[PDB]
């Protein structure tokens, strides 16, 4: 909520999580806020995901400002458990990162372009 500056539509979120499911079975993904943060700093992150139901908000707070100065695109997911299942975990995830997509590079590029049109 405090780190959220734009609302992402349910349709765009469906596209995003589907692209993440095929990113783990082909390319490579980073699961968890610590690994997502290191990906943005190292530059290896292509697209970063962030949950909106994170309590406390401090865990994720830095991602929207850190990604802006590193050129890495970010998208908001409504639920924590949906992002965790999409990353391939039994538990939830506050943040996920796509470190070089696989056979979804065209979809990821479009998601990154649809988010910029939504500010």
């Amino acid at each position: 909520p405090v780190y959220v500056d734009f609302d992402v539509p349910a349709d765009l979120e469906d596209d995003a999580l589907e692209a993440l499911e095929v990113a783990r079975d082909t390319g490579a993904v980073k699961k968890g806020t610590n690994e997502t943060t290191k990906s943005i700093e190292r530059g290896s992150a292509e697209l970063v995901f962030v949950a909106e139901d994170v309590q406390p908000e401090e865990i994720v707070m830095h991602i929207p400002e850190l990604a802006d100065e590193k050129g890495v695109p970010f998208i908001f997911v409504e639920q924590q458990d949906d992002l965790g299942h999409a990353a391939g975990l039994e538990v939830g995830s506050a943040a996920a990162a796509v470190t070089d997509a696989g056979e979804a590079d065209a979809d990821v590029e479009d998601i990154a372009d649809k988010v910029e049109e939504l500010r």
């Binding site: 405090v2 943060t37 290191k38 908000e57 401090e58 865990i59 707070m61 830095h62």
Partner: protein, 194 residues
């Protein structure tokens, strides 16, 4: 590279600036309507919690406690007292608000033991501290090579005997040399002059 934790830490260096200023303004409204001791699933300051000993494991409990701001809630003398002992207003307690918070939490959870605590802010009338408590009887902790020390019989009610980090600091045990003549090994052995 930097950890994600270092960002939670850097935000808490200035709790009146940035996104945290807005967060605390919102959170405190919910906290003021909450109880004296409120168990919370996850810590507000993950970095500080983990730094203090917290683990996302079974038997590790966190609880937020609110204690009132200010000096001693002192009653005026009802008998003869010399001028030096006639004060009410300027008397302050020897235990800090953090230690009062740790004790109140430990009493709400009789079976658990206080590991550590940290500040999560204040408003005009009260202060909030989150206390990390541990279950000495849970096998998830009795087998933990980092936390199983708290399971020993001599660690029973450790907070009430001042064995917490906040306990040891308030007892004046920080310095190992000059200034700690009346504090080490205990305040009591030194005739209560610390």
């Amino acid at each position: 590279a930097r950890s994600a934790y270092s960002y939670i830490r850097d935000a808490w260096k200035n709790p009146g600036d940035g996104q945290l200023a807005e967060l605390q303004w919102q959170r405190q409204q919910e906290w003021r309507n909450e109880g004296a001791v409120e168990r919370i699933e996850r810590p507000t300051r993950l970095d500080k919690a983990r730094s203090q000993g917290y683990k996302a494991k079974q038997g590790v409990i966190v609880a937020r406690v609110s204690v009132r701001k200010g000096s001693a809630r002192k009653r005026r003398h009802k008998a003869g007292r010399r001028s030096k002992r006639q004060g009410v207003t300027r008397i302050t307690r020897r235990k800090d608000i953090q230690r009062v918070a740790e004790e109140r939490a430990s009493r709400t959870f009789p079976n658990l033991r206080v590991l550590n605590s940290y500040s999560v802010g204040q408003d005009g009338r009260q202060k909030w501290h989150e206390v990390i408590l541990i279950d000495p009887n849970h096998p998830a902790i009795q087998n933990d090579d980092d936390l199983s020390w708290i399971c020993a019989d001599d660690q029973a009610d450790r907070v009430f005997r001042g064995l917490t980090g906040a306990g040891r600091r308030n007892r004046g045990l920080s310095g190992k040399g000059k200034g700690s003549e009346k504090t080490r090994p205990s305040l009591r052995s030194n005739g209560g002059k610390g």
